[PDB]
Amino acid sequence: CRVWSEARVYTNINKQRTEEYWDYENTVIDWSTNTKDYEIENKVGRGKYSEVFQGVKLDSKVKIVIKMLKPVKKKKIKREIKILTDLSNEKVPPTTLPFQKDQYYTNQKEDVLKFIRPYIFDQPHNGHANIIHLFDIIKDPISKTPALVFEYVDNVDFRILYPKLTDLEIRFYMFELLKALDYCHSMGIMHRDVKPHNVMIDHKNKKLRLIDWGLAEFYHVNMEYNVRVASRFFKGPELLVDYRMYDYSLDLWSFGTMLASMIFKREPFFHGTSNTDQLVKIVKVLGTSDFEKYLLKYEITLPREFYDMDQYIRKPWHRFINDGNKHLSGNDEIIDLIDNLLRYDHQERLTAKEAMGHPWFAPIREQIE
């Protein structure tokens, strides 16, 4: 990195907290052997490094899921566990406390204070309740294969559920996902793989849970992260141009792409044929002028794989409106919200609390108290 960057908000969480909280390397995992605790039933999904099953906790009869880990990635398993336990064991979640603006906008560069929006959801909330809960850490008593035990959510695949959802229900659920992001960011953690497949929704209960903490990482000031994270269609510009000094705002780009998909009924929204073409697809919408301005702000030189970039005039968002999606896309508020999330420059993006204060969410906010 030539030009250094820090998170706009929650910048120093992992200075405030110590190695006991964020040092996952120097943990020892107490795997409990499952001789009589959980009964494995039928498969409910597959992961990149796991096979996931529904089952039952034998002593209470509670329905759970068991994520059986395929053999390896030991250090990254320890990271997933530390993050999950950090998120569930916090006695007093920061996002339940009264808001303190000076402890929230913690990056005090003049250039960054310009991105503070005139609106913000500044109330306590329960976003902590929207992170999937880890209940146990086990090994198969025969195989010795390790597994994670979680809360079960009665999910409908997004490709089936989302086309059913009304404008108001989309607003409701996306607000819930923002609460979850605000909380995890307040705890100094970036999810780094936000996408519909990682958001469990039990519609009849209005219940949303953010799952798949396998790529999550602790935010450390000026740390250079691996950019081979997220999933292609949801990777932000920082990932694609190899700007390693990124932060929680990556999750807001992903949230924006998810939002844009839902509202415009175009899934995925940015459909690149390869990693390299994913960037081209973004630039073909956001335009080359602002792309070049971004590279220059950070003195980014593009990875070896890239050539042009060619000249594309920005495609305005209104261009994506059609008869099929106009009931979700035909108001000025959603356009503005999307435009404020999908920005090249990660510092420019809405934070979760900013986004939650946006006018598009007014009908959800009016129903809270």
Side-chain angles (χ1 to χ4, degrees), residues 1-18 21-25 27-31 33-45 47 50-56 58-60 62-69 71 76-100 103-108 110 112-113 115-136 138-205 207-227 229-283 285-292 294-303 306 309-312 314-318 320-365 367-368:
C1 290
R2 285 252 309 161
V3 173
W4 284 19
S5 172
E6 305 75 46
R8 198 138 83 72
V9 295
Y10 300 135
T11 316
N12 303 306
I13 300 309
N14 292 314
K15 292 185 156 45
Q16 285 165 3
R17 294 173 189 255
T18 58
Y21 183 77
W22 47 253
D23 182 340
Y24 60 81
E25 282 214 341
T27 55
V28 295
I29 301 313
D30 173 38
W31 304 99
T33 307
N34 182 29
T35 68
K36 73 202 180 81
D37 289 324
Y38 302 96
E39 163 179 17
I40 309 76
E41 295 172 327
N42 62 284
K43 186 157 162 156
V44 299
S50 83
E51 298 196 327
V52 184
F53 295 79
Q54 162 189 312
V56 306
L58 287 172
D59 68 352
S60 63
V62 169
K63 195 177 296 162
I64 51 65
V65 311
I66 308 196
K67 183 180 163 173
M68 291 166 197
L69 299 165
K76 278 171 141 140
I77 298 167
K78 290 205 227 160
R79 186 183 59 190
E80 183 175 358
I81 297 173
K82 197 72 172 76
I83 279 164
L84 286 164
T85 67
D86 273 356
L87 297 168
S88 73
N89 288 16
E90 190 63 12
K91 190 172 183 212
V92 181
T95 34
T96 63
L97 298 171
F99 178 61
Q100 300 174 246
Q103 304 300 302
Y104 177 69
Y105 290 117
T106 49
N107 188 341
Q108 298 284 326
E110 167 154 38
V112 182
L113 297 178
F115 298 135
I116 293 174
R117 297 323 200 266
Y119 45 81
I120 187 166
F121 180 66
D122 69 4
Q123 298 293 306
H125 63 70
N126 78 331
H128 73 277
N130 291 349
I131 306 303
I132 198 76
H133 288 335
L134 183 71
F135 285 162
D136 215 341
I138 75 174
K139 281 175 142 166
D140 182 286
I142 307 307
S143 292
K144 300 306 202 285
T145 310
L148 305 177
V149 180
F150 296 91
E151 157 181 27
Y152 173 79
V153 184
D154 186 8
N155 185 55
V156 176
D157 183 290
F158 76 102
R159 301 161 280 193
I160 298 173
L161 181 61
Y162 288 6
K164 302 174 179 305
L165 295 178
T166 70
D167 182 17
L168 292 177
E169 287 171 329
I170 290 167
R171 288 174 198 228
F172 173 90
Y173 288 117
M174 291 307 265
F175 193 84
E176 291 300 308
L177 179 52
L178 287 166
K179 292 198 298 200
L181 295 177
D182 185 37
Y183 171 59
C184 80
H185 293 165
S186 80
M187 296 289 286
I189 290 160
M190 307 173 279
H191 186 277
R192 307 201 293 188
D193 198 21
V194 171
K195 68 184 175 170
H197 258 319
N198 293 342
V199 180
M200 296 299 86
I201 300 179
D202 172 0
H203 188 42
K204 71 196 179 287
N205 289 317
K207 169 149 69 164
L208 175 150
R209 299 288 182 269
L210 184 55
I211 66 154
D212 193 4
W213 295 86
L215 301 173
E217 183 57 280
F218 292 99
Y219 176 66
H220 296 281
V221 177
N222 303 127
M223 179 168 271
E224 294 202 353
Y225 298 91
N226 169 36
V227 299
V229 298
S231 319
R232 181 159 306 155
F233 308 139
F234 302 85
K235 292 184 192 246
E238 50 268 63
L239 300 188
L240 298 167
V241 306
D242 198 24
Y243 187 79
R244 298 180 188 160
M245 203 172 289
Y246 63 81
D247 63 64
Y248 318 106
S249 58
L250 175 69
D251 295 329
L252 283 292
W253 169 277
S254 304
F255 171 94
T257 66
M258 166 171 179
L259 182 62
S261 171
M262 303 170 88
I263 295 301
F264 292 124
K265 288 166 150 283
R266 180 184 159 96
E267 204 288 299
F269 194 76
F270 296 120
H271 197 313
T273 61
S274 58
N275 191 73
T276 317
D277 180 70
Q278 184 72 32
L279 182 60
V280 177
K281 293 280 186 286
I282 290 153
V283 178
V285 176
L286 291 194
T288 292
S289 178
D290 288 331
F291 184 61
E292 279 165 354
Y294 162 65
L295 297 189
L296 178 57
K297 175 177 175 181
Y298 295 101
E299 298 194 7
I300 298 167
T301 283
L302 297 72
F306 285 95
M309 196 80 50
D310 313 62
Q311 294 298 141
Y312 308 102
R314 169 165 189 267
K315 185 172 172 184
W317 295 116
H318 192 123
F320 292 92
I321 295 166
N322 60 42
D323 275 339
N325 66 36
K326 65 170 187 233
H327 68 294
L328 304 180
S329 72
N331 67 71
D332 283 357
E333 287 85 19
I334 185 56
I335 304 291
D336 183 78
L337 169 58
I338 286 164
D339 188 58
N340 280 276
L341 293 158
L342 294 184
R343 295 279 174 95
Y344 288 116
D345 182 359
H346 57 276
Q347 294 174 11
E348 263 181 47
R349 307 172 192 144
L350 299 171
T351 67
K353 279 194 205 299
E354 285 164 357
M356 284 183 284
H358 191 280
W360 194 63
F361 293 112
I364 303 301
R365 291 199 304 274
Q367 295 183 276
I368 294 165

